[PDB]
Design a protein around this nucleic acid. Structure first.
Ligand SMILES: [Ca+2]
Ligand SMILES: [Ca+2]
Lengths: 158, 157
DNA sequence: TCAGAACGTCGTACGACGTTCTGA
DNA sequence: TCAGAACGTCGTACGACGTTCTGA
């Protein structure tokens, strides 16, 4: 692992630059609560170097690689189980994205209990908090969307 | 020390992603041979995180930081002396860009003798091979232009 | 009902050039 | 004459979303 820690450090550098540690509110039509707080780590690269994404997945021992239809490729670790393990590996070497990683780790604490509306609501608040740290400009689903909906659904939060 | 090389491994990962190890032929009108082969490592980032570039310079202990006029900032290490040292630190850890690093290291061997047009010509040929590895689409000055010019200048390749 | 796998694309933060300033 | 320091900006390779597919 003296060896491994060099890999993780390298990877941390790569994610700090060409990566994206994020947390979204995704609409889920068949969820009782209508929404999920998705958490993810993602690495982007031109498909012409698709292989490096496969090397990251080997390093982490989880996650998926895909080519998108525009010449780009992506590596993605989605969801509490895989992500938490991944982020603890990178956390000591992350510099730019340590805020998002720590925040996402708080979200992951909550995900087992997001069938409870107040918990789902907590997580979504945290999710918006991550979105302020990123360079996103297309984010439309906010915590206030969740709060309006939860209320309309008959639940009680604040 | 292992703490240093965790820094360099991180830096390598950062350069691999948001960096640029490069070689260009720059026009220099007061040069006898009219051209320089410039070598450089550069790290880009939005000025809103200007500070990270200052950390990289602290880690490398050389190079310069600048704010560009479009919200971007850059950390640059230019030229053989400081560059060779930098690239040797990162080389064990670079993955995407190890080819440019090695190629540029070949160029750096030649730079102390680029008053010799035959040597300038070799360097310029190498600088072209680095450019084929980058995603550049704006490259104008090729080795062919150095050769055309040297010959016009009365030199022999 | 869940929720990852797999996906499609908008907007710019990068990359990667070429050029002028400065001074050895 | 050199050659880094400092520069200005074009074109896209990224980021960072939101949506459909699949199956537990
Ligand atoms: Ca970046
Ligand atoms: Ca990149």
């Amino acid at each position: 692992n003296f060896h491994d820690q060099l890999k993780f450090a390298w990877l941390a550098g790569f994610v700090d630059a060409d990566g994206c540690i994020n947390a979204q509110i995704v609409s889920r039509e068949d969820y009782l609560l209508k929404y999920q707080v998705r958490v993810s780590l993602t690495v982007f690269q031109s498909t012409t170097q698709h292989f490096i994404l496969l090397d990251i997945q080997k390093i982490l021992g989880c996650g998926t690689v895909r080519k998108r239809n525009d010449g780009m490729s992506e590596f993605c670790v989605v969801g509490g189980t895989s992500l938490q393990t991944t982020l603890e590996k990178l956390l000591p070497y992350l510099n730019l994205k340590r805020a998002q990683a720590k925040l996402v780790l708080q979200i992951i604490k909550k995900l087992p209990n997001t069938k409870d509306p107040s918990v789902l609501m907590e997580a979504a608040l945290l999710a918006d908090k991550v979105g302020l740290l990123t360079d996103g400009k297309k984010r439309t689903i906010l915590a206030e969307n969740v709060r309006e909906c939860l209320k309309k659904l008959g639940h009680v939060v604040s």
